[model samples]
Target: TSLFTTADHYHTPLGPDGTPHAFFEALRDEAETTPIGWSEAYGGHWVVAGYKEIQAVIQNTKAFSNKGVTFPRYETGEFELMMAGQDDPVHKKYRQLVAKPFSPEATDLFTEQLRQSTNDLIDARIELGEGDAATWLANEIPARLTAILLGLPPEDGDTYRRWVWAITHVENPEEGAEIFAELVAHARTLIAERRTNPGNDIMSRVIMSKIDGESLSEDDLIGFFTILLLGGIDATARFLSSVFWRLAWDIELRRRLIAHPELIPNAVDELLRFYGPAMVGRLVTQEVTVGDITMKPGQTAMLWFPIASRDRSAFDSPDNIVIERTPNRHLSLGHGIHRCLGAHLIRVEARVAITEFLKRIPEFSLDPNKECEWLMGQVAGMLHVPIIFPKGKRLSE
Candidate 1:
């Protein structure tokens, strides 16, 4: 009747080489045997790693509420993602406010724009011979794209990046609280400005959104802005870094994709399956039984998306990068109603980012001299990815 606990797995150093897949692979193996293990990391919560178990928890929304979807609450309480953290009718209502803009068709409208942004980023630094792709490419593409969707000044991306970093990466509670308030103040001003002079952005649309013939309160609008602001920037950046990092080392895989560009789309899904950086939590709405462990109401379950995606039973040779792997059903984008709202946009962004990068700079790899930095926690990502590629002229030139 005893439970297996992954003691401090979440906080432990990823490894000497900073490779997280190996670390997560071990965790996945442990979960295979236990299915439902307890992790003492980030206080205490159930760590659900089995592929089927996670799907069950995700699909059964009644028993597992999305409220407080993060096991370890952000230092500041300002991250109560309105739709992302709500349940049922409440969540649907808020999500519908801006769903059309995020729909697949609407996201396709940004295809050319996304491609241009990616090219612009590479053109800006391509002639430099080498740079931190983490900052130059991975970070800026999403930063600029997020700004585009929010109607924020494109030049203020660095400001948003800094605020997101402080709030998400820094542990200072007071600092996080202060940074959150400052961000909220910025959102308030944007809301006020958009009110007088509306723009064709999600922020402006959400401001004018109505449900049941009633407009959302100012606090609701701020919460919407907070969710989009925090969600839009770093997650995709981390993903892009991971993909580029893999390509930087795996010359064979890179060559394969380059030779057969048609494989890029499937490769994106495989990369997402292999290197997704987000793991969310679900609150127990009622007493629920998952793999012999009965959880009480109000208990939290941290769903390790990467671990579940690596489940050996679910996919043969799950550890290996099978870019051509078909019928690949992974929860990297999550599942059910609470699935990621920006899923379509993210796919396009990654596809275009990688396609354009390889198109322009096919011969690239990590800079052996500069050290790479990996930030590991509940949400893992590369903070610095120093890379070196052959000197090349800008595409525009």
Candidate 2:
């Protein structure tokens, strides 16, 4: 029951050449679903591709819910917070408690942390003359940031990074699930510390909040961190890896993004649209008309964020990254109440991380000789990206 295959990992076609936008284009031209294909896999669900139609499914919470945020869900998936995995009424109050901290306006509080992590990461790697940005920059910033937010020792970023990597790079479901058990154990100890001696940190914040003077269950505290950890690490690592891949090859584009840090926000938005890595799944609540198909109760419906972002009907040139892409309504993050609790924080970190790196490195491009690998799972990410940048002295002193 535990030993799984490599092929058992990928639920969709992704990776270097099989980019979702390109794959979706092929489907748009050839498949009967054209946009929304009713595939028999995942217990027979619709693979939605249209932007407006995807909005329809996620926005209409009454008919469809985010019960299937993770694939192949078992009874245990029920243990998550009422945030992304749970629907309204149940979701409403819990979100309100932490909403202010995660809101766009509050993301600036972490600007210093994001800036420091980016600088330290670059400083550590600048002298290499060449290295994988994934290791040097992409993974480091998020790890440190997440640790700081979760109120873990900042130096433990590397350890947090390892756990984050193992969880998403899940080659062995048996071993990988084992990793989660370790994390849950680790979280329990931390939550216990926060309970008796609360501080000015996110975990403490969660511990202090009350609902009609009623505190959360022990399971709820554990569940909150579990959800936060997966989300905090997975998306940013996948996302930043993708941006570097694009920047490494498309030097002109890279230069442009770096030269104008102000454009980082828009560019990040465009990047999220063209290269987001969410294979968002929803469980049908009742009979629902999503796009062209009739989704019945108890079926799992998959929403390809990249596919929806690239739908021709929604944008003028869907496949390309239009920098000034006005009205670029990309739901790379989920939609409605479940639209990624960390969206705002993700944006600020990306901008700060990318901006800081731009100022440090002179010039860089992909190392042509090495093979940069990719993984196509429910979450797609670059496994390796060797790059050659101008050598520089250490700034870490």
Candidate 3:
């Protein structure tokens, strides 16, 4: 121990009503004095909040290993995050197995589908003059997109959506474990089917893929499937929900994006910076020093991406959301070799979803009567976001 312990003022694993930005804003200030401080939250873990420190930690894989990506290390029992949780060579090989399907070129093939699906959600909500963007649009689009990409039935998107949410958001590990089992069992069936009757989908491609000219084992298949499903559906949904919330919460922000559609992409980047969706953890393999603090082996460090993104030293006007903020290098999509595989896809979804929302439903705001519920945890997102707008025409109709 390096003698830098702090109170749990950060209020991690924040409750539904926990205002993370406010809590982390204070944490950011604290970080200016002490960049990496030990937190008592989640059973004693080092909290690294500074941008340079986090960048250093993630880049130095020798010191900070990705073995324990989840803070407090929730047990998935027999399940392992084969690709993402692995280091260099293993991670690289496994990542290569599905890289083509997740490439920007591959994502572009489905852009029109994503645009149409987004419009469909908006069309339904616009006709009613109100709807929950969180559930109806934010949740719906990603699930549909994942299904289309994975060869899973588009109709079962909601079921997988439910599974993804429960796996991460559920309080009990056993319950989440059971849900994981169910999801894996369901995916296993599809994997088996694809083994024999291969389709022109990602699931089929991966099943048919080889590592060093050898077939992947059963667990590898399941792990890949699980990560893909979770990555594709959950985080993007939460990220989009926050983005949608921002669009509704800020009238001028929404109007500006509506007036200048090109700025919507920048707006997405700004919202991503302001409201990062995930916080990743790393396991200390050996003695390492970030800033002035030295961390020993076997210790856990939670990289608060949201806090790092808001660090005043790194970002100009860090507190404010400037849609045109240039040189915005946020850690929300992560960094280094373990960077998010689906980063391009998430950006595509955000740009399309926001662009379509602004194009079709130019004027909207949060519904005063219906309250938005925020889901707080490793994944910070809205559980519900009800909004009201004038009844608008459907482009699809």
Candidate 4:
């Protein structure tokens, strides 16, 4: 258990040039316990990569703080907090505030809408038969759904989508936060509207929601709103790149999923296990030792979730995608109180979006005419994935 700079494993995507899961595989093979390592790209922080070790760190909040929940800590040393950044009482109390709103029946309104949205995106080019599936479908579903959640104007999906990509450059925190600051301030204007002309939307519910019987404030809503904005759009958007990319190349895997839609939910868990997004961050509130590595107070640790997901000890074949794999407990969304607040929403986004997509154009593959530009960082995704599929009928018509 020692330190090494294997950050490139994440920077490059899956290919001969890119190592895919090799970095973590090496760590897993080399050490019994994942040694908390170091990185210097966007400043420095300890890397926590062990599967069980990640669970231990996230679950054991006493030793960690979710406040500065990014490795390259924010410039001011403070960050956002609603559910993602909050601790015990705050995490617990606020989690209840929005829980009912995002519940099955409540969130079900977006289900049909997502199906419609996926079709809407695909309908534009379904007849054409060849389009960048990533651009057309993979990204739009989450952004539109996120827009609906915040009750923002439909056009704002693009805005929030931009912010989603912007914040992932944690390599440059202040610059990213600078962009985030404007998004929050602008959202506050809508927050003010949702306050008086409160709609059935999340922001409205959040304002009306109580913490210790007190209504959520504008400032409170800023942090909270951004959390939903990013959670709704960012990581989930990137995660989709994998789903669609796999569909393009793995024809059998795609048909198998479409044939038995019942399998999609479990597949969601496993897919998330395999290509989960969002590199989590935590501050050391107290000095703690992870394995033999002792982390001191005031420093931060980057929880390499994807690395942990592929831990050789945790699963039989962590490298391969067994969509039917059971007992597959993956920390893709996260663990403990900070587990993804919008997890169900993201699942519905993935399932309904993909179902509508493949149901429409089940057969597709990478465009031999074009190459994909990959964006790999905190949230790894491709700029666009050009796919060639048969000209198909649109359910719309």
Candidate achieving higher TM-score, 1 or 4: 1
Residue-wise lDDT of candidate 4 within 362-394, one digit each (tens)? Answer: 788889899876666656755578899888877
Tens digits of per-residue lDDT for model 2, 1-397: 1111111226545535635444556554432334566665544556665677677777778887776666665223236744867777768877887888787777677788678767877877687798888766776677677777778876665666556555555555656556656677788899988889777777789887788798887677777786677777767777787788778877778878867777888887888877777767788878867555687888877776666666676678776777878866788887677877888887787777777777887578888888777657667867567788889877789
Residue-level lDDT of model 1, residues 280-338, one tens digit each, is: 88998899898789999977888878888988888989989998899878888798998
> Runs in model 1 with CA error above 4 Å?
1-4, 7-12, 75-79
Q: Looking at model 1, report the run of 10 residues with the lowest lDDT sum.
A: 1-10
Error at 204, model 1, angstroms: 0.7
Clash count list over all predictions: 0, 0, 0, 0
Query: What is the Å distance of residue 266 in model 4 from its true position?
Result: 1.5
Would you list the rank order by lDDT, best first? 1, 3, 4, 2
CA deviation > 4 Å runs, candidate 3: 1-18
Candidate 2 lowest-lDDT run of ten: 1-10
lDDT of 4 at 285: 91
